[PDB]
Backbone:
């Protein structure tokens, strides 16, 4: 038989291992020749594996690279302008790669050029609340200072935005062992920890869903009109550069001014973590000087798009996508995901060669330039938005398959909760101690739901990966899954460093490739069910449950201000009414879906299911973020990686007690309540009988 | 049999006459009790006629009314402030209606209050080119002047916008016999001409598709958050009032300053048509004073929505809608249209009672507040946008059925050209001299296509009626049809006056109701075919033909500036490439559509047909007009009634030689070319094979 079991049994750990090795021998930085060669390799192989068509879709987008003959670095500089200490020009390469060429040195992609000199201020994680503490409570002024911030907690682009708005003239990002060195494990090559010479690369844009900075709304094709750099979306206005903790210790050890306000501001280095501004008395006249010379350059990128045409509903697309570009070798990020996709394509293609076709069309994507701002996925979705709007069933992401070896992690739309529970009850746990038990059982035991006994945690989707355009702009049901760490004992330490290699994975994370295989089973199984189930495997009642939770949550935030809710007549009644209606209507729709031989009623019903995530899209977008259009979920305005629920109302409430004109501020809260209640009611109404 | 012929034969001229009489005995001004009573009457009757459900959908929107105890009027005022002449406080009522209560006096809906006093400047039709001539060529400055403008040529809201931007402090609109009195016909009650006491009511907003001024984007429901008046959309900033030609002659006869620049500025009154500013020597110290006291008021409106559920595709909607609210009696506008809709519902309901149901669902709408800015249709579409986006097949408008008795007028999307040609070849001509000939034959003879021999003229859709939200915001294929005048011998003279009565229609326009019946046949026949044809009756190849015409046209406009196209490298190559591709792909799609028992392939193909108009929507909208989202068609920025093709490129080119920064101006032309080429290519691609 050709059923899900046939598909799942064909997946092999040994094949994922071979592909991972194959994809991680040389760097595949977006825009480089090596990455174009790997795109052509994947295109050829997906053809051989049996897909109906496999094409390259290319775009010319803004990328950013260091200057090879004018390296970026940071100095401590004395009274005379002598540079008495310089940060490293490259990470010491790992064993056996010391002769690999074209390893891009650590840099912050899209930093402007400059050589700012100034006094340091230490701003902890450079979160919104860190700057509030500095400015409001400690009365420290960052204006015209160089800020030094530890990586961690939030997306680095939010850190740079927050430093910019505080008036900083430069930002230094570093990896503190508190956040990147797990107690009791050795540094790479001897363990999975970050060494003191290790440095995390990464872009520092604030694109808010725009994709290529020069072409927001439209694909960056051959005839595209591009904005000038001055009007580009998301670019930082101050220079930024990342360093490791050996170098950080040298910049921090001399820090003076004020002490850290409390222990949450202290990392693990043997330094005081003084906030400054500037150095202690002896060194008070030394300054810090950045030298940044990177350039932004329009550069060609290549997505690979494979199609397995559906036998019954070819105009319904289920998409499995993840990126191919890496900062260096991409041993975890992204190739651990790309190898899993490669083996999924191979398994589907094996079934196809035996005569099977899925019910719906499956599209497979190897995206480019994810590391530079989700550019490949976004430009493709911009090009194909009308097809995706009207035909897109679901998007399953496939970046890193592992960030630990403890248990499963799933983030997805509520519409896929039931599918995930059901699929994981049918899969074997790879975990020690759970031999012969289901993945559902191991996962639920290790990661219990905070709301429900006997159920596993499933998180909201945030952003910082290629599902953003599909979910938050276009409203296509989306999900992701990987193996993760115990967030109780301790991202992963070697993230975006040169040390993320095949050997890291094979020696320390997944020597048997059993966690990779489990993740291939979850991702591929989801794609299988979505593309093959007669009735789409979405349960609208699961959205009704979560909408009530989010309504309670946002009402609770507002209720911290009872006097203002009285004064400005701020009512949540319409939002709870809408959520009640959604719950009633979804319950009735579910009865019909179970109670309805009629392919038109079915597809009618399949379309109601497919367009339900679509209904939460507001074509006017969220305030000042036109490409975040989903009214229930957006990336947090303080941390792109985190999802926020009822984001329009959340941001209207955030720090409201500091607003100068409360009448205006609470009016905007009321406006966002109206928009949310309306959108929830309108989405409910798409599930009513159609006529 | 239950086929189109059964439907068409059931329609009766005698019934349209009875309904027209019934709908025009009292005023039905939006927001008044009389109009709510008529809504309830129609709701009851549509139920009796056999529709499955008939509901009222209400909204609370900004309306505008004169103050009953503080009447609006205009004066000539002397040196002492004595008002030596006053305009009329009401139109003399027609015979037998002199005792009708609640006739709203002439006013400009949404005018602000004020009593500006000043010197007059006469600005012809107050078109963009009239103000260019005044300011650029004649060097007359309107700043702080009261402008007097003749009605005609363009929507009155464009006149008021143009006067405002010229710095006027008030606007007086009047009806010149040149534009509202046909030679050789008598004034009402003795003929169909406008008498000198007649005055055209009408709103003067510039909403650009927003609907209710206080709630753009969202329905004006019970919990809606409303903008303050200061932030409302579209409201004029200067007082405006309309007058008849007896009164106009009194204001114009004393005009001094400059002579009219040429004869196109002279109407038919026995006055010089001096542009002024101000009066001739003897009267140079007299001024004109407006007294406007109307108020804007949030007021409840009611749409009637009837549903005839589809037998096979209930989740596909074909919509026949027109408005019910009138300025006074609405003898032509809208009740000549509403009576036709009423008889169409009755005919469909007769078939239904015999056991028939259309293939798709048909929705019937009696919209409210059309006269105040398309408010009822727009708020409903805002409420139901997700249902309409994903399910809307087509929208057929049904305002005034007649504006003359000469021949047919059709304005529609290219997708309906073939449907219209085919339907009219099957209908009988009602015209004298064409007994036993088809409507297609009479229409083509009287209104030949300017491009094609043996074909009739079909115009682009403009705006100023209830199809705007469906077509230009939502991208639902739309059309309209009515009987019209010979635009060669000579709107209609009694437009929006108290004289538009049942007797006007019965005595002078259509005593036998045969033109009404013909229009019921065209509108109802279109609805029938759209709701019943197995394959949707759209021909994508007709769009390919018109896109090439519009590309040639906009390229020709640009080519008036060959030096700038050289300097800034302005190429139309991508747009012609896209149009060529669309033509190739549409040709192939058409072959498959004819060459394809498979209901999934059919509906797949029906969805490609339905979503083709949808594909021309840009979710970012046009520049500063976010609710005009169709890239091929928008209402002209100089005249809401007229359609403009490639509007983004057209407005970027318009008056470009006057722009201060040509580099920026031509860059924006290039940007609009890119957006248009991209959108045309993306629409073409929705017609490619789906996988
Ligand atoms: C959840 O679904 C329910 C339906 O099951 C839906 O209920 C609707 O609520 C609206 C808004 O409250 C009701 O609107 C009323 O409609 C009547 C006519 O039917 C009007 O007369 C009412 O207006 C009067 O009262 C108002 C409030 O006191 C005054 O402000 C106003 O000036 C009028 O005097 C009012 O507009 C509607 O009838 C029901 N529909 C039903 C029960 O079928 C509810 O809105 C849904 N929730 C959301 C968020 O959409
Ligand atoms: C109409 O449909 C046709 C397809 O039938 C479609 O043709 C496509 O045109 C694009 C844009 O011109 C072509 O893009 C090229 O793609 C090749 C790789 O396939 C690239 O190597 C090319 O880039 C080189 O040359 C450029 C121009 O000289 C340079 O600017 C660039 O730096 C590179 O050196 C180029 O990107 C594409 O191949 C075809 N596709 C085909 C033939 O299948 C056309 O775009 C459609 N019209 C619209 C408006 O979409
Ligand atoms: C996840 O799996 C659960 C458990 O199998 C699925 O729920 C079950 O779905 C079936 C099919 O809809 C339900 O059976 C139905 O029962 C009703 C009588 O109550 C009957 O009228 C129908 O003909 C049909 O037999 C079953 O009740 C239901 N079990 C539950 C909810 O406990 C669920 O659908 C799966 N989720 C997916 C696939 O997304
Ligand atoms: C308006 O009416 C015209 C004329 O009837 C319709 O065009 C005709 O449509 C039929 C059905 O598609 C075409 O017949 C087909 O012919 C091909 C062979 O060339 C054959 O393979 C098919 O099986 C089928 O018999 C016919 O050619 C065509 N006539 C034309 C274009 O001259 C047209 O579809 C109507 N428009 C509508 C309904 O919107
Ligand atoms: C990754 O695997 C691919 C495919 O097996 C290898 O590419 C092939 O290399 C052989 C021998 O050089 C050629 O004859 C084929 O044409 C290639 N196939 C392709 C590109 O589809 C590639 O060498 C492997 N890379 C590494 C680093 O081992
Ligand atoms: C840090 O690097 C800088 C730049 O390479 C070094 O300063 C340079 O030293 C060379 C050789 O002595 C001089 O010719 C240049 O004039 C210097 N350049 C600048 C910009 O100052 C500096 O010596 C290094 N410091 C340490 C401690 O290694
Ligand atoms: C327009 O026609 C309607 C329907 O025939 C008339 O309304 C009916 O009037 C009768 C007699 O007064 C009542 O018994 C019915 O209840 C009404 N039917 C409705 C409202 O559905 C109405 O009188 C006519 N109007 C005019 C001006 O002739
Ligand atoms: C135009 O109308 C105005 C306003 O009604 C008239 O002026 C008023 O005349 C009355 C009675 O004589 C006075 O009590 C008011 O003081 C006047 N009001 C104003 C605002 O001036 C005026 O007489 C009318 N002119 C003509 C020619 O009929
Ligand atoms: O530009 C963007 O939006 C993201 C680009 C790039 N994305 C990325 O690295 N995403 C990673 C980030 C991440 C890794 C591990 C985690 O546990 C978490 I939470 C986030 C991922 O989603 O796996 C980046 O964060 O620098
Ligand atoms: O607010 C709006 O957009 C339009 C409201 C109202 N609409 C309206 O009267 N439309 C009329 C205008 C019209 C009448 C006859 C014509 O030949 C033409 I061209 C336009 C119609 O479309 O039949 C108006 O123009 O005042
Ligand atoms: C890189 O720096 C070199 C050496 O100073 C310089 O010649 C070149 O302009 C730079 N390259 C860029 C800006 O891409
Ligand atoms: C911080 O310092 C800058 C630069 O001198 C100054 O303009 C700004 O107002 C200061 N802010 C506060 C709150 O002290
Ligand atoms: C793998 O699991 C073991 C056992 O819990 C653990 O001690 C080790 O830290 C894990 N490896 C990684 C990279 O998390
Ligand atoms: C209308 O004018 C009267 C009479 O002067 C006045 O009392 C009332 O305020 C006005 N009504 C309004 C503004 O609606
Ligand atoms: C028109 O008159 C106004 C008001 O006095 C003046 O401000 C404006 O500049 C004038 N415009 C021109 C072009 O003369
Ligand atoms: C009706 O048609 C006749 C004959 O052409 C014409 O003279 C008359 O003006 C028409 N009536 C109207 C209102 O157009
Ligand atoms: Ca883009
Ligand atoms: Ca609205
Ligand atoms: Cl992922
Ligand atoms: Cl109409
Ligand atoms: Zn990644
Ligand atoms: Zn990454
Ligand atoms: Zn009308
Ligand atoms: Zn009208």
Residues:
């Amino acid at each position: 038989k050709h059923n899900m079991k046939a598909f799942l049994d064909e997946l092999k750990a040994e094949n994922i291992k071979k592909f991972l090795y194959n994809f991680t021998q040389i760097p595949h930085l977006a825009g480089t020749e090596q990455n174009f060669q790997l795109a052509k390799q994947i295109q050829s192989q997906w053809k051989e594996f049996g897909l109906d068509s496999v094409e390259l879709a290319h775009y010319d987008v803004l990328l950013s690279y260091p200057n090879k003959t004018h390296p970026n670095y940071i100095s401590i500089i004395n009274e005379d302008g002598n540079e008495i200490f310089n940060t490293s020009l490259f990470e010491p390469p790992p064993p056996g790669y010391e002769n690999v060429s074209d390893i891009v040195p650590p840099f912050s992609a899209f930093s402007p050029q400059g050589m700012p000199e100034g006094d340091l201020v230490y701003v902890n994680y450079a979160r919104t609340e860190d700057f509030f503490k500095l400015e409001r409570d400690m009365k420290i002024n960052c204006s015209g200072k160089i800020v030094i911030a530890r990586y961690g907690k939030v997306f680095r682009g939010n850190k740079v935005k927050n430093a910019q708005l505080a008036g900083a003239k430069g930002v230094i990002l570093y990896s503190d062992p508190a956040d990147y060195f797990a107690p009791g494990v050795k540094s790479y090559p001897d363990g999975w920890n970050l060494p003191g010479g290790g440095v995390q690369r990464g872009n520092i844009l604030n694109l808010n869903g725009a994709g290529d900075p020069l072409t927001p709304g439209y694909p960056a094709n051959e005839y595209a009109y591009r904005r000038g750099i001055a009007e580009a979306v998301g670019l930082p206005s101050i220079p930024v550069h990342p360093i490791g903790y050996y170098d950080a210790q040298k910049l921090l050890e001399k820090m003076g001014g004020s002490a850290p306000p409390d222990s949450s501001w202290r990392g693990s280095l043997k330094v005081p973590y003084n906030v400054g501004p500037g150095f202690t008395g002896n060194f008070s006249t030394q300054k810090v000087k950045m030298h940044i010379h990177s350039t932004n350059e329009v550069t060609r990128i290549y997505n690979v798009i494979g199609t397995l045409r559906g036998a019954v509903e070819p105009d319904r697309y289920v998409i499995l996508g993840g990126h191919r570009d890496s900062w260096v070798f991409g041993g975890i990020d992204p190739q651990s995901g790309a190898a899993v996709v490669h083996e999924i394509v191979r398994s589907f293609g094996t079934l196809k060669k035996e005569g099977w076709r899925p019910r719906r069309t499956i599209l497979f994507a190897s995206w480019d330039a994810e590391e530079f701002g989700l550019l490949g996925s976004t430009e493709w979705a911009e090009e194909n938005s009308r097809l995706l709007q009207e035909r897109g069933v679901a998007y399953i992401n496939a970046d890193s398959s592992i960030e630990g070896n403890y248990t499963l992690r799933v983030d997805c739309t509520p519409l896929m909760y039931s599918l995930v529970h059901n699929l994981t009850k049918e899969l074997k746990s790879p975990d020690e101690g759970f031999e012969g038990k289901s993945l559902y059982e191991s996962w639920t035991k290790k990661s219990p739901s905070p709301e429900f006994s006997g159920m596993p945690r499933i998180s909201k989707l945030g952003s910082g990966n290629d599902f953003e355009v599909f979910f938050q702009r276009l409203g296509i049901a989306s999900g992701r899954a990987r193996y993760t760490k115990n967030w109780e004992t301790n991202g992963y330490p070697l993230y975006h460093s040169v040390y993320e290699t095949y050997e890291l994975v094979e020696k320390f994370y997944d020597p048997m490739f059993k966690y990779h295989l489990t993740v291939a089973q979850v991702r591929g199984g989801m794609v299988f069910e979505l593309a093959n189930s007669i009735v789409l495997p979405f349960d609208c009642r699961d959205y009704a449950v979560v909408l009530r939770k989010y309504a309670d949550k946002i009402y609770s935030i507002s209720m911290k201000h009872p006097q203002e809710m009285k004064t400005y007549s701020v009512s949540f009644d319409s939002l709870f009414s809408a959520v009640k209606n959604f719950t009633e209507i979804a319950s009735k729709f579910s009865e019909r879906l179970q109670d309805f031989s009629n392919p038109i009623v079915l597809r009618m019903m399949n379309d109601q299911l497919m367009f339900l995530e679509r209904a939460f899209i507001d074509p006017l977008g969220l305030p000042d973020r036109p490409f975040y259009r989903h009214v229930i979920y957006a990336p947090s305005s303080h941390n792109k990686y985190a999802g926020e629920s009822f984001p329009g109302i959340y941001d209207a409430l955030f720090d409201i007690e500091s607003k100068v004109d409360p009448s205006k501020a609470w009016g905007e809260v009321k406006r966002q309540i109206y928009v949310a209640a309306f959108t929830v009611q309108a989405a409910a109404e798409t599930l009513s009988e159609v006529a």
Remarks:
- The longest strand of chain A covers residues 295-308.
- Chain A touches chain B through 53 residues (CB under 8 Å).
- The radius of gyration of chain A is 25 Å.
